[PDB]
Design a protein around this ligand. Sequence first.
Ligand SMILES: [Cl-]
Ligand SMILES: [Mg+2]
Ligand SMILES: [Mg+2]
Ligand SMILES: [Mg+2]
Ligand SMILES: [Mg+2]
Ligand SMILES: [Mg+2]
Ligand SMILES: [Mg+2]
Ligand SMILES: [Mg+2]
Ligand SMILES: [Mg+2]
Ligand SMILES: [Mg+2]
Ligand code: NA
Ligand code: NA
Ligand code: NA
Ligand code: NA
Ligand code: NA
Ligand SMILES: [Sr+2]
Ligand SMILES: [Sr+2]
Ligand SMILES: [Sr+2]
Ligand SMILES: [Sr+2]
Ligand SMILES: [Sr+2]
Ligand SMILES: [Sr+2]
Ligand SMILES: [Sr+2]
Ligand SMILES: [Sr+2]
Ligand SMILES: [Sr+2]
Ligand SMILES: [Sr+2]
Ligand SMILES: [Sr+2]
Ligand SMILES: [Sr+2]
Ligand SMILES: [Sr+2]
Lengths: 246, 145, 119, 115
Amino acid sequence: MQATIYDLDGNTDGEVDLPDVFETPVRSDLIGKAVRAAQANRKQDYGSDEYAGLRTPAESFGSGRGQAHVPKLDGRARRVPQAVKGRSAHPPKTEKDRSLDLNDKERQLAVRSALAATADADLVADRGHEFDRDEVPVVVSDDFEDLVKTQEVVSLLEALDVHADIDRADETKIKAGQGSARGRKYRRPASILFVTSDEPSTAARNLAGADVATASEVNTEDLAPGGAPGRLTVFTESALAEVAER
Amino acid sequence: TSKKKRQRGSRTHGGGSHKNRRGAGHRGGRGDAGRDKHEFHNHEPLGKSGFKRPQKVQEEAATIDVREIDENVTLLAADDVAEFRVDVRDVVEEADDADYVKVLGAGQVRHELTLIADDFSEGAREKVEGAGGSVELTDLGEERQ
Amino acid sequence: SKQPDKQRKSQRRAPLHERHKQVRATLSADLREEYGQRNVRVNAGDTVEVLRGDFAGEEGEVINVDLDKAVIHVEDVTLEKTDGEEVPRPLDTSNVRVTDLDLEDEKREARLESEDDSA
Amino acid sequence: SKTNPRLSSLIADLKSAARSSGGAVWGDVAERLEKPRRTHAEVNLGRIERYAQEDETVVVPGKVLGSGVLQKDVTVAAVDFSGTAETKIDQVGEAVSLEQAIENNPEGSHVRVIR
RNA sequence: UAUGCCAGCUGGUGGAUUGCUCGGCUCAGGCGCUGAUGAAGGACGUGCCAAGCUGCGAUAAGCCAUGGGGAGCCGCACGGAGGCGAAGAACCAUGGAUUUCCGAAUGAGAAUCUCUAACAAUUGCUUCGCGCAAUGAGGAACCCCGAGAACUGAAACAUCUCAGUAUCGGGAGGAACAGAAAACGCAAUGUGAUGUCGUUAGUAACCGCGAGUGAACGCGAUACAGCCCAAACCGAAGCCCUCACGGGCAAUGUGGUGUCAGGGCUACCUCUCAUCAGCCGACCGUCUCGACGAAGUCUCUUGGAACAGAGCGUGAUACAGGGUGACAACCCCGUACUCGAGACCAGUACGACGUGCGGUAGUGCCAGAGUAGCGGGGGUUGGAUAUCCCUCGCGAAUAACGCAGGCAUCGACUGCGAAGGCUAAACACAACCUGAGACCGAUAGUGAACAAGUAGUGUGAACGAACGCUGCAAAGUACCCUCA
RNA sequence: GCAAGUCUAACCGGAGUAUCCGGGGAGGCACAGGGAAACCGACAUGGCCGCAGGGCUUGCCCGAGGGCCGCCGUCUUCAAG
Ligand SMILES: [Cl-]
Ligand SMILES: [Mg+2]
Ligand SMILES: [Mg+2]
Ligand SMILES: [Mg+2]
Ligand SMILES: [Mg+2]
Ligand SMILES: [Mg+2]
Ligand SMILES: [Mg+2]
Ligand SMILES: [Mg+2]
Ligand SMILES: [Mg+2]
Ligand SMILES: [Mg+2]
Ligand code: NA
Ligand code: NA
Ligand code: NA
Ligand code: NA
Ligand code: NA
Ligand SMILES: [Sr+2]
Ligand SMILES: [Sr+2]
Ligand SMILES: [Sr+2]
Ligand SMILES: [Sr+2]
Ligand SMILES: [Sr+2]
Ligand SMILES: [Sr+2]
Ligand SMILES: [Sr+2]
Ligand SMILES: [Sr+2]
Ligand SMILES: [Sr+2]
Ligand SMILES: [Sr+2]
Ligand SMILES: [Sr+2]
Ligand SMILES: [Sr+2]
Ligand SMILES: [Sr+2]
């Protein structure tokens, strides 16, 4: 198919062929699988102290003094799992492999399938993004890579009728639960992903919920935050081409 | 929901009487214990058989069936065409870390093939020739006397 | 660090010289234009205006500055004890704004005016 | 519980056909595709060659692989073809997906199920 | 209806629950030795008032210098009194001063004190005098060298297994150990020091041939680096102390040469750029620390408080995180960008000085002995005839010789020179620094968020808890009555 | 997911720097077995039944898979079994 290119003012400036990849049948099960793996693979091994609760010579009197055969020391029960201050029976373990393997072919098929989800305005609108175009992905002039100021990108997004999605992300959530005690107090919606080719757009990255990526290494999680296909993307003319061979 | 998940409340988690899931007695001994007594059924019988020749005096031949060579003739456009001629040694994978390449006669030879290998089977020759083909031993293949 | 526990810790356990920044307040519009800074380290002598408490709106001279508890006492921003004695009610410098500065110290003045450090 | 959305639609299609049109092969192929993957067919060219005849679409309720030789000019319909099977087949006949077969032949006539 | 039963209400008791986190737990990166110049540890002191903690040491919560910092300060600890600070204090970095007693503890002794100058004791050098030096002890584990169980498994049990594990003795470092072939043996016209990682492989091998135990060569990587003696031929041409004088060492050999690309000598050829000794000496990168750092504290309503709702507005290479009287990019710290400093990489790389590589011919001049190897007895190992080691006994050759190639001997073939030595890097650990988290959230998580190894138990070795939350602000309850 | 193949391990490069993108096929399992070993080395189908499904002129054909046999490799074998 064909994709319309845009100049930094928002006017059409010709068009190019949308590479075949964008025709890959959207496959949300493979995509979610790939995204599930990436998330697991960055989780850190953990587990309680191997000796926790075991530092005691506590023993069990056995039969004789009308007490259950529980190990005690200085008259307090210890060690055993049912004992307050006792060891943890089946605790988290460092030895546990918390990673997930993913056959390269199965993963690459997911990146391509996620790429395709990008060219479906309906899918994109379904996923939640708020825009007002008909054509998507949004392709832009390579000169986009030369923008420096964040606001130069805002104007361009408003001119492209895509800024609404940023308005969407401009509303953080204060999560429920103790995550906050561990530095996870906030969370915010995912919005536009900018795919350039030379360098990640420093100009766009700070935009609410915006994710910046480069064509040679843009991944499944980039294209489908949380395994949800159809993210509102904006490729650079050159990035659009490089992506053709992933 | 999985089996495991449904166990809370069951008390015995499927082990039957709670007097069951204890130590190794419930297994009749640890590991292969009793392999010649109580848990003797379905176990290679006790024994000592044959012998082994030293590994550096052994030969691993690389083999291929005519059927494989034949089914790929045209495909092997990078391997001679005359009145097809093929040097097996250049076809069989695992030919480097192998003592010699042997052609086996499993299947059909629907072409006139001139095969070059270190060794062939009686049936491999019969088939190749029976198709107006020829068989040629390598110089290594000269060790056939 | 990005972890809350540490963040609060470094704030609560910061050395004295590192505590001056815990008593900084925003400067008035005129003062911002005059010194190329957005805020300043509140001093005993500066004039400040309350922008948030129960006293928001009032203005007075900064009488005391405690780096230990990181708070300030502002003239007339007080509470009345049970016996009637009138005691100061501490303010957080982020709830206040400097409108007039005391520049008797050649050093401080030189700092504000310089372009490098943000007094 | 199939996880692939496509295999899932293909099955709903095969049914819709077998029920609406005169299909039965389609409902028969849907039946097998609903069973676990190990039961699905894995057929190499050699077998399609041995039992196929021109003007009779070969229907594999599974995936077609590329071992062996195919010389017959037959149209093979399958859930999927390996990159090599599709290639070797196109050289002498035509490789089509079941989604197409149901499209041109909803009555599922003149067909040969191969596994 | 008393005594009383069941449920609720009001108020207690209790501290679950919810919310909160100054502590944990785990992972990752960095860094890494201290001590007779008396360490680590401990005791006892030390404050205006001072019991605990922290700090410090009779100069005693400190003294001095340089830089930073800055109008405040006098630790935890929010009191009272008083004091210090523009003579620039506090605070921070680096450097220096002081640094009681016991302690390896070293003049002798001793439950932290005493008695009459002391490297105690063992050594090296030695002016043969403690004159000059060394060792000692500590450290979270890691590492090297020795000693070495049992419960257990085998459904008993002895070999075997648990396991060369636990534990014990000795010792080094920041890493250790290993290491430039008498190698390998995909047997070859092949590889080419050593660790380590992946694999080879639960393969070969072991084994009441039961249970079980269990490599290697090679390959793919990481990192790469090769050298020095003994001897031959020379023979004092030499080394150490001292400013010097002078002394000490050394023919039982200092020093030159040389080290399997064998070497030496004799005769030639050619050449330096190998090596070895020594000089100079980083970039970058990584870790930590620091400077700078944009933009609202506008309106209305609610509220004790606006960071809330509604409205208007702004930055962003900064929409990580925290603070602030409630949900904050724009109030404060900070965060992006940019910059600086220290440490490590590293006294390394490069560069440079000196030296001199190598090759031909002749030459039986040299080349590590209780060794190689064999036997008796053991241990160990996958090592089976073919592992490695200990012990007792016997015991060779001399490069024209010797060893190895998984039984022994002889020949052939291929590989290689043992019985002297050094050697960077890549790898282990986690005290220490920093970072991180689908970890726990105060009966959890460390035994320990608090007084934590605290209070407390035991003659001692050793054992060992519990205790988190006023409020936005102490505004932490004046005056009055009652009452001993 | 890929398919007569399939997967990389350690590790290397990049980067948004524990994630992720690219590279790495050493090696493993599968592609031939039987024999202690020496050594030797197979049905891309020859027959009959027949489920599903297809065809036809509506019992008759085609009949994958399946079932019963043949035959093939090898070990033992005077052969045979
Ligand atoms: Cl097949
Ligand atoms: Mg516990
Ligand atoms: Mg909750
Ligand atoms: Mg059993
Ligand atoms: Mg200024
Ligand atoms: Mg036993
Ligand atoms: Mg080691
Ligand atoms: Mg037994
Ligand atoms: Mg070996
Ligand atoms: Mg506790
Ligand atoms: Na303990
Ligand atoms: Na793990
Ligand atoms: Na360190
Ligand atoms: Na002496
Ligand atoms: Na504030
Ligand atoms: Sr009893
Ligand atoms: Sr038990
Ligand atoms: Sr038996
Ligand atoms: Sr290979
Ligand atoms: Sr303080
Ligand atoms: Sr305080
Ligand atoms: Sr090397
Ligand atoms: Sr020698
Ligand atoms: Sr032999
Ligand atoms: Sr409690
Ligand atoms: Sr006792
Ligand atoms: Sr692959
Ligand atoms: Sr059959």
